[PDB]
Design an enzyme around this catalytic site. Structure first.
Site, PDB file in Angstrom:
ATOM      1  N   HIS A  30      49.722  44.233  41.185  1.00 10.95           N
ATOM      2  CA  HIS A  30      50.255  44.161  39.835  1.00 10.95           C
ATOM      3  C   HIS A  30      49.280  44.705  38.802  1.00 10.95           C
ATOM      4  CE1 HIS A  30      48.377  41.008  37.246  1.00 10.95           C
ATOM      5  NE2 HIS A  30      47.897  40.560  38.391  1.00 10.95           N
ATOM      6  N   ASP A  52      53.802  41.891  46.248  1.00 18.22           N
ATOM      7  CA  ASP A  52      52.699  42.471  45.483  1.00 18.22           C
ATOM      8  C   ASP A  52      51.380  42.392  46.246  1.00 18.22           C
ATOM      9  OD1 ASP A  52      52.438  43.750  42.749  1.00 18.22           O
ATOM     10  OD2 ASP A  52      50.731  42.370  42.720  1.00 18.22           O
ATOM     11  N   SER A 104      42.562  38.579  38.683  1.00 16.44           N
ATOM     12  CA  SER A 104      43.527  38.338  39.748  1.00 16.44           C
ATOM     13  C   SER A 104      42.975  38.893  41.052  1.00 16.44           C
ATOM     14  CB  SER A 104      44.863  38.983  39.402  1.00 16.44           C
ATOM     15  OG  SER A 104      44.845  40.362  39.717  1.00 16.44           O
TER      16      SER A 104
END
Lengths: 152, 152
Positions: A30, A52, A104
Site C-alpha cells: 500500500h 496487499d 507500515s
C-alpha cells in the site's frame, strides 16, 4: 532487541519498511517505492492486492541471515520497536501518539522472541488505539482490519 | 601511503575500480558497466580488445588531482591495497589469499608512491601466487599473463 530489517525510501524521505520473514522476503503493497538494497529488490516478486503483500524468495547469503516465526498467537503482552502491545480478543493494541504515517512493516515479536505477524497501521482513538494486521492462521494467511480507519 | 580514488558501480553493485595515470584514465576493458563519477563518464573511451584496456584521456578539470607514475623498476618488494608484493623475473608473486574476482583495476604502488603497474587477474599453483599485470616500459604497453590465468 535490535536486529536488521531493510527499509524502502522515496526521494530523500522514508516511507516504511520491508522484512525478511524466515523463508521468503515480503513487504506491504500500500506504500510505493523500491527497497534500498539492490540485491533484495531487483528480482521479480509476486503481488496480490486483496491482501496487499508483495513476496518472493530470498538470495543465498541473505537466506543465511534470516528471522524466525511462529504459527499461533496466545493472549498476553508483546513488544515492538516503539514499546509494548497487548493482544486480547483478537486485538493487538497500543497507546495513542506512538507512531507516524510511514511505519507500515515493522515486525512484532512475542515474549519468546519470534515474529507473530505484520502491521498495516490504521487505528485511532482518544485513548489506546487498535491495530490492523496480516497474520498466519496455521500455515495460511488471513487479514484483520477494524473499521473506522484508513491505511496509516 | 595508499589511495582510495575513483571506483566504479554498476546495477547497484560494483564491478571494481579504475585508476588514472599522469595524463589519462585507464580501465580494464573486459568488465561491463560504466563509471559513476559523472565528470569522468562524459568522455569517449578508446577500446582495444586485443590488449584489454580502456583508454580515455582526462580533461583538465581534475588534472591537478592526478597521480604519480614511472616506468623504471629494479627488483625488490612493493606494496598495494591487499598487502605486499614481490617482483622477481617480472612476475608479481604476492603474499596471497586476499585476491578476489570483480576487483581488477587495483594499481600497483612502489615504495616511492609512483604508479608502476595495474592488475588483471590471478593464477595460483600454491602459495605466494603470481598474478597477471598490465604494465609498460619505454612507450611499450605489454600484457603479461603467466599461465592458466584466473580471469578476474
Amino acid at each position: 532487541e535490535h536486529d536488521c530489517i531493510f527499509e524502502v525510501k522515496h526521494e530523500g524521505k522514508v516511507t516504511g519498511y520491508a522484512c525478511l520473514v524466515g523463508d521468503k522476503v515480503m513487504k506491504p503493497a500500500h506504500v510505493p517505492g523500491v527497497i534500498d538494497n539492490i540485491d533484495l529488490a531487483r528480482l521479480s516478486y509476486k503481488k496480490s492486492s486483496k491482501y496487499d503483500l508483495e513476496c518472493a524468495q530470498i538470495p543465498v547469503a541473505m537466506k543465511s541471515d534470516a528471522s524466525k516465526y511462529t504459527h499461533e498467537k496466545p493472549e498476553g503482552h508483546y513488544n515492538w520497536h516503539y514499546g509494548a502491545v497487548q493482544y486480547t480478543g483478537g486485538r493487538f493494541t497500543v497507546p495513542t501518539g506512538v507512531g507516524k504515517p510511514g511505519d507500515s512493516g515493522r515486525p512484532i515479536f512475542d515474549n519468546k522472541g519470534r515474529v507473530v505477524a505484520i502491521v498495516l497501521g490504521g487505528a485511532n482513538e482518544g485513548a489506546r488505539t487498535a491495530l490492523s494486521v496480516v497474520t498466519w492462521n496455521k500455515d495460511m494467511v488471513t487479514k484483520i482490519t477494524p473499521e473506522g480507519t484508513e491505511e496509516w
